[PDB]
């Protein structure tokens, strides 16, 4: 069975970066991709951004776009997003949802546990 | 000279067993291998026209397969007048030598 | 000239390679597992290639949706006619791509718009896993990506239709390039059977390629958009870095200039990118002129060159050649030509693919015989 | 680092035989497109060629006196010996010893001097 | 971009009876390529998401038959026939023709 | 800026200062058509628009049964 | 490379011939009068010829009935759109066959579906006085049954438009071919120009025809559907059958082998059927490798051959070729190169098309001159 | 099943195992197309279908004559 | 076989000439300007060059007349369906003119009906300035002037489409033309490899201009409609009139005739406009034959030339040519073959491309070394 | 009147008759379409004529663009 | 030989200025030529690689151009440390000829 094995919860001060890891295991990472979204609490879900893990493109968010910026190491079938500069509505819940690796339609087929991020003063 | 000599010298059978002779090249020649099989006191009769394909006039039940180094000579349905030498010849450069021979033996 | 010193290599090799692959028994029903929930996704198959599907056209769907109310039944609905055009218009795509499969047996080139549109080309170039300055070159020059690939059908069963789409890459990018042109060059006296002739057969493009030369000969092969040269590395020879040596010292030892020689000197002139080479010979009369001044330049027998600033014809004999008008600066490099070296009671004049190092060696063998 | 540095005797009685030698580091006489040589100058005068050895064994001298200057190389010992016999007072000049690389793209094949020697001087004094 | 409005923002429903989930789209979803992409997705407190239909009528692998998606163009529906003590949660809808997918408000099922 | 230089000693010129865009290798890319099960059309109509669907899809089915003949 | 070896012949021969003869008075109302009452019959012409005559579409009658009492009045009724959008549906085949008509002046090649549907080709297939075998075989493999044939107009007058379509007639099946590779074989010393190097000419297919071998010399011509070769007898040589001799002793006396000879050691590749053929030379790189194993073997200098199994890709300098994935057994005899026999200082390097005993006789020469 | 041999001796390869269509003769056949008498059209109405349907029998003659030339 | 010694014109030059000063900056107001009152008016451009322009379709106005009002609105009226038709029709002219230039990248040759209908090509070769003769020649033989055009894409810019389509000019009319077909002349003995060849190379077509003869090497490019012969000076050489002289006396001292060499006498026939020639050697069995007589002629081994009367089908080997059944006066001229004069101990067999004159002088210093 | 001779001295055949067509020159002439200046559609009506004329003018657009990219 | 002279000698110029040396070749020669600075006392340097190419190591501010007969070296922005002497290199055929160089000097 595919799972997304996330990180744990982080807890940190405004301002700094985060940097987020969703493993992926029982398929070739190298023939999908990722799209991040976040899910603050008492809110819907919105989508963040897509990265494929097969030719690197990128695409965010208009509200996100800029403090956005995903890494994907295939070589060790886990992807991250690193998220600059964080706002105090950004504390939210994390999830990974596959994707495919071209520009196509959505799959979100699998999904990760989570991560909480919360920043608090 | 390309020798040919066949592994299986002296292998008996009874009626009704499967025989393969096999003859090997000291290099790899595609095909141009014939088989002869002699009976005792009589002249040799060819069976095996190349790698794969039949002499007109012979029993159907005689079959051949190879290329490279390996022949085989598949033999199904043995009668008791099957009981002779049989011979390996390469033709693909000259001269042309022939194999030691099998002699086969009936139970 | 020199295009018998290729290798043949099959370029729809990849192409018919995954075909085959296709072909086996349960990959197309992966292939529909794969494309389940998506557009576009990547499919292991049992070769070990991993290759990006893509579905342009589902007729299925509009078949199924629209016309299995209507005469799938016995009392059928009258349509209306603009279902009727509508399914022209989705159909015939469709009958454009099997009426050019027909014709070509499978194998079409160049890709036409039927086989890939622009937009879905466009999408699919930039979706290929390389770098950026290889997209942007691809997607700006996208008629020469056309040019130089193959569609080439592999299946149809299990109500899905598959042909596969072979894309060039262009692996090398802003390298420098030079073509080469050549004309004849002849003797000019005034006896007509005693000119013996040269010309250099590695005519053609060239363009550096990680420390050598890649080698065209065949010109007319490679394309020309404005500055850039789009070539094709199966077509062409990889040679070492001193055939760049030619061009200021065709006797240089380290590396032999490739000619080829004869005894007819005929009257032809090469339009190269920026001017003209006319050898002009026997009682030919040759000139070159301008569109409203008339005749601006007459040659003299033998090896000679004019610019396209102010020509813009050139008349050798009968035949006219308009010069190219492009903007560019021409040099005139003044110098003995080559063929005044040799003794003509001993140039051998019977070689269709030689170098100077063999008419050299022939030369020296002739003076040795006597 | 490339390193280049001359030696050898800098007064010569005339009609005799100068030689040089050039030692260098940094750099194999063996890899493509390195070829080491030496240029002269006279002082007041211009700089003139006298030969050089390239990676693949060729070599030329300048036409005007290859007769008189010749150069023998040892990649082994690491040395590069310049010989010229019959010592002009013209021949007065500081000898540099070069180091050489090509330009191999854009269709070009030009050796250019891009390293050079400190040089050293040699004086036909009576 | 486009902006999915989800109906039915609560969903008191009672045990043995079917709840049906609705989400209306501001375009049309059939892409160039004809097929029209929307999905749902059910999310369990405390758990990861998970998809349930891929596209419109269309069961994924290991769904129990009991989920059934309808519609198509521009209206889309969920029909849950039976409601269990494992189906609590909120559902979201998403379109993955036209850049950036969007979800709806995840509406709550709750058990009377 | 292009430029072409003539070598009368060789009677060849040389035009320099193009950039490369030499293809070394090829992408395979597999394209997909899904195509309709339809077996045979049951309808009797006279209507020349039914007439029209009828033979369009006829001319399809033949492009399909020619694509299964390659 | 042996393409001028062929003899000139004119392949709308036939075509024009049949053509020629329409043109006549009277034979246009022959044609009339023998399609009278069915839609195909054989018609006598003036030259004695049986051709049989076919009629693939009738816009008269369609105008005649349809058209005539709409627009051919005064007070025209108002037509349906569903009349015109059938008249144009129909009157579109007439369309493209008048433009493939003018843009080719009345010779088309191959013949497209608007000359002749699959339809119609396949009735014309079955109708043609010939074996079963020869039917099956036409009938299974039209695609190169249309590419071997052609479209050549021939009279538009008497309200008749007539066409002569040109099918090819298979008269061989089922014997035996097989296709010759050939790469150049060279020398291996470090010397950049001691290089010597000998390249069979005769490479192209072979197909077995009533005792003799046809050896077709252009192998780009001939089309290959699966195991089966479609050829053309009139781009063909007819050989003797020692021929085969060549390929397992090259210096028999009974046919003398046909080889070209320089000294341009190139690196190249040959892609052959079931492998490659790699020829590293000089100081090139030539490697084979697997697409997910990387780099897998490497060549030394000379003639080798990789098989299939495991490589996908092989690279030649800065060239890469892509070997055809073909299921099939390889085989490789090793043996010592024949260049190797050959003393450099008097080898014959300036033949483009020689054979074994040229050269031999060459050299002969060349040590009796000595 | 195709099976390939290579000679090192030769340097050449040989692909066997092919089965023959080698065309021999030609066989030509005469396509027919019956082609309508029109020598003008007197409709005067200005209706667009009309407009439509001499369009294109102005384009069918069109090709008539131009096959007529060649 | 001569075709390497035409000089590379560009032929495109002219029409990409006017294109790149249809780029510079202003160029397009003037077109424009030109064009505001009339449909077809000559321009003066930068280069001085006075080009007729022309206007072939315009969309703008049926655009901006007729579906503005209807797509331009919020409130939009339901357009009737044959204004959807009437836009489909109007617009698929530059649906094909805009697919066939990315197929074409640009270039496209031949000039397509899209290109350039029939009525506006034949207005357009009308309003040409020149000869009373050359327009009837070029309008009564459109099909090989659209054949000899490129078109060529210039600009798209300011609602202005252009592309500079490039017309043949036919300079030169009525010369008597000739075209000489050669097949190989080989000696007859029963020894298989003592046989040695002789091939004259100069075949192809000549007509007459202005005092000389253009050699069109390549018969394939010409076109022949009925007793016209269409082809390009471009590709041609210019020769002195005493290559008429070839015809009557190959070893006159005037003109060296060109012939090639060889010893493999293979089995040949070269289809001429009026008769075959047949080459039968070795154990060939070569006829002529009737197709309602069988068999009417056996060719012996040699060269031998068979008459259109009576024959339909000629036979050479395994290979089957039918011969042209145009009428016509064939005449055959007996005489020695040149063949038989030559010492076969001597003769030189490794030529491509030589001379009368260059065999019988390596014959000679071959002669002299012994 | 097309007359052919052969020469049994050289194995070759004339055959002479012919009327020469040979081009010398090139004559250009520009040819202009003349396109709408349409920015963008606003119709947002759901007919399926004008869903027809929607996809026409889009395709329209992309020969444009595509002759544009040229 | 080709031989190539400087027609300025001894151009004098201040801080600011912009110099341009000016070697001419006695006949056409497309590039090929290179540019060294010797300070007195001290080895020369190259600073234009070929026609219209910088040296790497060099300070950007020279620039060079010319083609065929006439090539220029183009000096911006003039530092104290620029006294030298200049030399052009001919090397399009072999001998390798210098010229006489410009002795520029300081204000």
Same mark, same amino acid.
């Given at each position: 069975?595919?799972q997304?094995?996330?990180? @744990?919860?982080?807890?940190?001060?405004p301002?700094?970066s985060?940097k987020? &890891?969703?493993?992926?295991?029982?398929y070739?990472?190298?023939s999908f991709?990722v799209?991040?979204?976040?899910?603050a609490p008492?809110?819907?879900?919105?989508?963040?951004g897509?990265?494929?893990?097969?030719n690197?493109?990128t695409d965010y968010a #208009?509200?996100?776009?800029?403090?956005?910026?995903?890494?994907?190491?295939?070589?060790t079938?886990?992807?991250?997003?690193?998220?600059?500069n964080?706002?105090?509505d950004?504390?939210?819940?994390?999830?990974c949802?596959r %994707?495919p690796?071209?520009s196509?339609?959505?799959?979100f087929?699998?999904?990760?546990?989570?991560?909480?991020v919360?920043?608090? &003063? | 000279?390309?020798?040919?000599?066949?592994?299986?010298?002296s292998?008996?059978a009874? *009626?009704?067993?499967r025989?393969?002779i096999?003859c090997?090249?000291?290099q790899?020649?595609?095909?141009?291998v =014939?088989?002869?099989?002699?009976?005792?006191g009589?002249?040799?009769?060819l069976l095996?026209?190349?790698?794969?394909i039949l002499?007109?006039?012979?029993?159907?039940r005689?079959?051949?397969?190879?290329?490279?180094?390996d022949?085989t000579?598949?033999?199904?349905?043995?009668?008791?007048?099957?009981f002779?030498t049989?011979?390996?010849?390469?033709?693909?450069?000259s001269?042309?030598?022939?194999?030691?021979?099998?002699?086969?033996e009936?139970? | 000239f020199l295009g018998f010193?290729?290798?043949?290599?099959?370029?729809?090799?990849?192409?018919?390679?995954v075909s085959?692959?296709?072909?086996?028994?349960?990959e197309?029903?992966?292939?529909?597992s794969?494309?389940?929930?998506?557009?576009?996704?990547?499919?292991?198959?049992?070769?070990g290639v991993?290759?990006?599907?893509?579905?342009?056209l589902?007729?299925?769907?509009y078949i199924?949706?629209?016309?299995?109310?209507?005469v799938?039944? #016995?009392?059928?609905?009258?349509?209306?006619? !603009?279902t009727?055009?509508?399914?022209?218009?989705?159909?015939?795509?469709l009958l454009?791509?099997?009426?050019?499969?027909?014709?070509?047996?499978?194998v079409?080139?160049?890709v036409?718009?039927?086989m890939l549109?622009?937009?879905?080309?466009?999408?699919?170039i930039? +979706?290929?896993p390389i770098?950026?300055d290889?997209?942007k070159?691809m997607?700006?020059?996208?008629?020469?990506?056309?040019?130089?690939?193959?569609?080439?059908?592999?299946?149809?069963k299990?109500?899905?239709?598959?042909?596969?789409?072979q894309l060039?890459?262009?692996?090398?990018?802003?390298?420098?390039?030079?073509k080469?042109?050549?004309?004849?060059?002849?003797?000019?006296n005034?006896?007509?059977?005693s =000119?013996?002739?040269?010309?250099?057969?590695?005519?053609?493009?060239?363009?550096?390629?990680?420390? &050598?030369?890649?080698?065209?000969?065949?010109? !007319?092969?490679?394309?020309?958009?404005s500055?850039?040269?789009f070539?094709?590395?199966?077509?062409? /020879?990889?040679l070492?870095?001193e055939?760049? /040596?030619?061009?200021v010292?065709?006797?240089?030892?380290?590396?032999d200039?490739?000619?080829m020689?004869?005894?007819?000197?005929?009257?032809?002139?090469?339009?190269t990118? /920026?001017?003209?080479?006319? &050898?002009?010979?026997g009682?030919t009369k040759?000139?070159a002129?301008?569109?409203?001044?008339?005749?601006?330049?007459?040659?003299?027998?033998?090896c %000679?060159?004019?610019?396209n600033?102010?020509?813009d014809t *050139?008349?050798v004999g =009968?035949?006219?050649?308009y010069?190219?008008?492009q !903007?560019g600066?021409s040099?005139?490099?003044?110098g003995?030509?080559?063929?005044?070296f040799?003794?003509?009671?001993?140039?051998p004049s019977?070689?269709?693919?030689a170098?100077?190092?063999?008419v050299?060696?022939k030369?020296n063998?002739?003076?040795?015989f006597? | 680092?490339?390193?280049?540095? !001359?030696?050898?005797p800098?007064?010569?009685?005339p009609?005799q035989?100068?030689?040089?030698t050039?030692?260098?580091?940094?750099?194999?006489?063996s890899?493509?497109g390195?070829?080491?040589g030496?240029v002269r100058?006279?002082?007041?005068?211009?700089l003139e060629?006298?030969?050089?050895?390239?990676?693949d064994? %060729?070599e030329?001298?300048?036409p005007?006196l290859?007769?008189?200057?010749?150069?023998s190389?040892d990649?082994s010992?690491? #040395? *590069?010996v310049?010989?010229?016999?019959n010592?002009?007072?013209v %021949?007065?000049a500081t000898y540099?010893?070069?180091?050489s690389d090509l330009?191999?793209?854009?269709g070009?094949?030009?050796?250019?001097?891009?390293?050079?020697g #400190?040089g050293?001087l040699?004086?036909?004094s009576? | 971009?486009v902006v999915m409005?989800?109906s039915?923002?609560?969903?008191?429903?009672?045990?043995g009876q079917?709840?049906?989930?609705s989400?209306?789209?501001?375009?049309?979803?059939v892409?160039?390529?004809?097929?029209?992409?929307?999905?749902?997705?059910?999310?369990?407190?405390?758990?990861?998401?998970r998809?349930?239909?891929?596209?419109?009528?269309?069961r +994924?692998s290991?769904?129990?038959?009991r989920?059934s998606?309808? @519609?198509?163009?521009?209206?889309f529906?969920?029909?849950?026939s039976?409601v269990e003590?494992?189906?609590?949660?909120?559902?979201?809808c998403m379109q993955g023709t036209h850049?950036?997918?969007?979800?709806?408000?995840?509406?709550?099922?709750?058990?009377? | =800026?292009?430029?072409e230089?003539?070598?009368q000693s060789?009677?060849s010129?040389?035009?320099?200062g193009?950039?490369?865009?030499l293809?070394? @290798?090829?992408?395979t890319?597999?394209i997909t058509?899904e195509?309709?099960?339809?077996?045979?059309?049951?309808?009797?109509?006279?209507?020349?628009?039914?007439?029209?669907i009828?033979?369009?899809?006829?001319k399809?089915?033949?492009?399909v049964?020619?694509?299964?003949?390659?």
């Open positions: 069975q595919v997304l094995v996330q990180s @744990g919860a982080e807890v940190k001060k301002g700094a985060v987020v &890891s969703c493993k992926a295991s029982g070739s990472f190298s991709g799209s991040w979204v976040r899910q008492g809110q819907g879900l919105e989508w963040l897509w990265i494929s893990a097969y690197g493109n #208009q509200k996100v776009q800029g403090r956005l910026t995903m890494t994907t190491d295939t070589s079938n886990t992807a991250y997003m690193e998220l600059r964080l706002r105090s950004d504390t939210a819940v994390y999830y949802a %994707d690796p071209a196509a339609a959505a799959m087929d699998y999904w990760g546990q989570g991560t909480l919360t920043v608090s &003063s | 000279d390309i020798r040919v000599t066949q592994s299986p010298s292998l008996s009874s *009626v009704g067993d025989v393969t096999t090997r090249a000291s790899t020649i595609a095909s141009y =014939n088989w002869y099989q002699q009976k005792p009589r002249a040799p009769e095996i026209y190349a790698a794969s002499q007109s006039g012979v029993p159907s005689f079959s051949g397969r190879g290329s490279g180094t022949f000579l598949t033999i199904n349905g043995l009668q008791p007048e099957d002779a049989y011979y390996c010849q390469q033709s693909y450069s001269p042309w030598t022939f194999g030691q021979g099998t002699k086969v009936i139970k | 010193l290729l290798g043949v290599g099959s370029a729809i090799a990849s192409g018919v390679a085959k692959v296709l072909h086996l028994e349960g197309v029903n992966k292939i529909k794969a494309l389940l929930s998506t557009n576009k996704a990547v499919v292991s198959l049992s070769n991993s290759v990006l599907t893509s579905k342009v589902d007729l299925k769907n199924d949706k629209q016309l299995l109310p209507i799938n039944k #016995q009392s059928c609905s009258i349509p209306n006619i !603009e009727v055009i509508e399914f022209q218009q989705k159909n015939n795509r454009e791509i099997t009426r050019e499969f027909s014709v070509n047996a499978g079409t080139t160049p036409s718009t039927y549109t622009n937009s879905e080309l466009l999408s699919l930039n +979706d290929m770098t950026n290889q997209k070159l997607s700006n020059n996208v008629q020469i990506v056309r040019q130089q690939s193959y569609s080439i059908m592999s299946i149809i299990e109500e899905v239709l598959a042909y596969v789409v060039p890459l262009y692996g090398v990018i802003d390298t420098p390039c030079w080469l042109h050549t004309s004849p060059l002849c003797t000019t005034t006896k007509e059977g =000119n013996i002739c040269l010309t250099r057969t590695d005519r053609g493009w060239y363009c550096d390629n990680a420390g &050598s030369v890649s080698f065209f000969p065949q010109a !007319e092969t490679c394309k020309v958009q500055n850039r040269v070539c094709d590395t199966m077509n062409s /020879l990889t070492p870095s055939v760049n /040596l030619c061009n010292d065709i006797f240089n030892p380290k590396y200039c490739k000619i020689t004869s005894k007819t000197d005929v009257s032809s002139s090469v339009i990118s /920026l001017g003209a080479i006319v &050898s002009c010979y009682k040759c000139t002129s301008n569109k409203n001044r008339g005749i601006i330049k007459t040659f003299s027998n033998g %000679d060159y004019v610019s600033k102010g020509v *050139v008349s =009968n035949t006219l050649y010069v190219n008008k !903007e600066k040099l005139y490099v003044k003995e030509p080559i063929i005044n040799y003794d003509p009671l001993v140039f019977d070689e269709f693919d170098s100077i190092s063999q050299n060696e030369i063998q002739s003076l040795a006597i | 680092q490339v390193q280049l540095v !001359e030696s050898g800098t007064l010569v009685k009609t035989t100068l030689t040089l050039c030692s260098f580091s940094g750099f194999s006489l890899t493509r390195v070829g080491v030496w100058q006279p002082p007041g005068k211009a060629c006298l030969g050089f050895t390239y990676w064994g %060729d030329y001298y300048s005007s290859r007769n008189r200057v010749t150069i190389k990649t010992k690491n #040395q *590069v310049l010989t010229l016999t010592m002009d007072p %021949d007065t540099f010893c070069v180091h330009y191999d793209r854009g070009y094949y030009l050796y250019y001097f891009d390293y050079w #400190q050293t040699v004086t036909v009576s | 971009d409005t989800q039915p923002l609560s969903l008191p429903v009672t045990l079917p709840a049906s989930i989400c209306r789209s501001s375009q049309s979803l892409y160039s390529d004809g097929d029209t992409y929307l999905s749902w997705f059910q999310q369990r407190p405390g758990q990861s998401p998809r349930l239909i891929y596209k419109v009528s269309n +994924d290991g769904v129990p038959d989920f998606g309808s @519609g198509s163009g521009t209206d529906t969920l029909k849950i039976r003590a494992e189906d609590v949660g909120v559902y979201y850049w950036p997918p969007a979800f709806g408000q995840g509406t709550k099922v709750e058990i009377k | =800026n292009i430029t230089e003539f070598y060789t009677c010129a040389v035009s320099k193009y950039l490369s865009a293809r070394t @290798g090829w992408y890319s597999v058509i195509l309709s099960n339809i077996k045979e059309i049951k309808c009797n109509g006279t209507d020349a628009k039914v007439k029209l009828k033979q369009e899809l006829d399809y089915k033949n492009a049964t020619e694509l299964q003949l390659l």
